[model samples]
Target chain A: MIISTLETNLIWQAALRAVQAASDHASALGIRIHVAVVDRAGLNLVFLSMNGAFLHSADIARDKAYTAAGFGFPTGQWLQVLGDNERLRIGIPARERLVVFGGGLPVLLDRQCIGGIGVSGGSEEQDEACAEAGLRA
Target chain B: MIISTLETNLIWQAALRAVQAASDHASALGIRIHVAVVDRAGLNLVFLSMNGAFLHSADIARDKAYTAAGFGFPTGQWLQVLGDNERLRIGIPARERLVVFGGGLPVLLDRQCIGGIGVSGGSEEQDEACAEAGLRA
Candidate 1:
């Protein structure tokens, strides 16, 4: 039998750091975007959007963040990991607020996965760049 | 008697101030929360969520605030005040974002109603407390 005890908390300041960086990067990219950060429990810590961003981007960003945090991996990686597993590929995406995409990245602190951030409102490549910028600081 | 107009600045200031108080209180509670503040017209002046809160709470909080401000009553009291009128109980809640629940309260300036605050991401009691806490300041 295997059991695991886990502690939970999300550093607001650190999460804000990610949010700020993402916002700055998206702005630089000329993309008005939506950004979301979620903790390990798949709860959002931050959800904000730039002016001119589509309203729907907020929900999509939240879904991506939730998927990344809940799964403990970058969201796009799920495609490769489950691409051949037809059941999971079709089934997992069917769940609510789970987006398998390139814009979600796990937030690691001290080599520990604590949360994740998601970005939307631009092309797939642009969204991933925003997420990567979010992870830098 | 002199006619008085509700200048937009005061409404905006009160909304911002209420949000600040609720956020500070949430930080003390060691919990992330969403806070919504709306003007007398039931328009959002400030809407934000703490890092690590649930995404769903964002809209719920806003709806609570809009309902409180538009109705000029605390959300928690809706059932008691309107419970006798079945039409209101059903008809009123049917309106979008009219949450007949706790965690929302109207703002009073010099005994004149001006705006409202809404809070979520905790127990009903806790959410109510945060709303009230925002008012006390």
Candidate 2:
């Protein structure tokens, strides 16, 4: 028997709303940011960048999305694991596409991972908060 | 009076519209394309990759946008200029950002250049067509 893939529309819509909220939050802090959302397959669904966001933020945002989608885990958890294993941190695949940091979060619906979101271009704390906002949105 | 720089909502809206139009055009052609739009200052306003677009196309799309924005000219025109004097091409600032190829077009409004759009993941002709569609839209 073959299992069919789940519909990701809700996940995608949730991520989009979350990123918009995150952008609003970043504005209140006087910090620009870039946010990216990806489905479980690591495919980008939506992205947004606040005015004045650094150019490099684009890459960081994309990488975070990839990391969260690829690992089926929140990037924050990955960072925690890496903190204790330097070698494992360095060995993450697609080094250019892995951001084991606070700004990436995996989205869960009904205890099942559905997708992920990543935010960049602000303090790590701010980025993480923004990503969390998206997840919660 | 002091001059102030700001990324207006108009630019972002225009960029998003351009990317959407380009992506739609690419889809009509049975082509998957990665597209990026950036402001005159070379800051990304929007980036998008249609389903199945190669990952490498993302980088190429961004570079094309950066090249067009930085040079204030179409990528094809830049290529022609460089062909006339290879040394001039090497001296172009932000060499890493420049892409002397097709698929990048500078956006103009009211007779002034405002930003640029880039397309990738298809043949040169197809990519150029997609970029042109963005400009037309």
Candidate 3:
């Protein structure tokens, strides 16, 4: 079988736009964040780290995008589902990837899921709000 | 203001179903296998070990999931991407997050990516096939 290249200019552009928009918002709040975007296939589209953003924020941001893309829903919704479940809280595998923290949002184009954006380094609400700004942009 | 949790009984249940399906098939083929399911964020939803499956299979299976989720693409694709550009392969912020080997498949819902599954403890082909079975299930 032949392998194909997954990276595309369009997707990267979209990711950049999302990250930029999120950064703008974070700047307004005197917060720093790392943002990451991924395509519908869950491939990384773009990543950005703001000044003063924690180094670990990069991985967290990536996870948010992965979570949103994987579930085709906002990461918050997944958190709610797990919060309502007891068994998942204890035996769930890959606890590190199951972030209940905020700053992840799904990107939609024409009401269809195209990808996701994740932000880290700020308060959960601030991170999510920044991500939302990026998605809207 | 909250982190989203990716763990859920539904995800776990789906993972179990996929693993069970793969296990039955592997048994018929005299293949030992390990399987894992992770949410879109690369967090493990469930993990399963078939009889005779080595302990190390668990880590490999989980790694596959992490690789697939982190890149939002098949693990095999990463191998090719890295092969093409040695420079592109270095200085990755989290080197541990990168996995170029195969046997991971992303999970999708409503034409949107949500997470992935990985399988190991067999030939690469066998591992991928088992992971695929879990994805389809």
Question: In candidate 3, residue A135 scores what lDDT?
Answer: 79
> Lowest lDDT 10-mer window, candidate 2 chain A?
A5-14
Lowest summed lDDT across 10 adjacent residues in model 2 chain B is found at: B5-14
* Candidate 3: segments with Cα more than 4 A from true spot: A1-10, A93-96, B1-137
Task: Please give the range of 10 consecutive residues that has the lowest summed lDDT in model 3 chain B.
Answer: B5-14
Residue pairs in collision within model 1: A44-B53, A45-B51, A45-B52
lDDT of 3 by residue, A21-124 (tens): 88889989998887777777665555555545776786898898878776667777765677766788565435666555667787766666777788888988
lDDT of 2 by residue, A18-117 (tens): 6668877887888989998887777776677776788889789878877877777877687667676767766863477877677887777777667778
Error of 2 at B96 (Å): 3.1
Best by DockQ: 2
RMSD of each: 6.7, 5.3, 18.6
| TM-score (chain B only), all candidates | 0.86, 0.86, 0.82
* Clashing residue pairs, backbone N/CA/C < 3 A, model 2: none
TM-score of each: 0.66, 0.69, 0.46
**Per-residue C-alpha lDDT of model 3 across residues B49-125, encoded as one tens digit per residue:** 55456767767787887777666788877746666566777644247755567898777666566777788888888
Runs of candidate 2 exceeding 4 Å displacement: A1-31, A38-46, A54-60, A78-101, A107-115, A121-137, B1-10, B83-95
lDDT of 3 at A46: 52
If chain B of candidate 3 is superposed on the true chain B, what is its TM-score?
Answer: 0.82
DockQ of each: 0.21, 0.27, 0.02
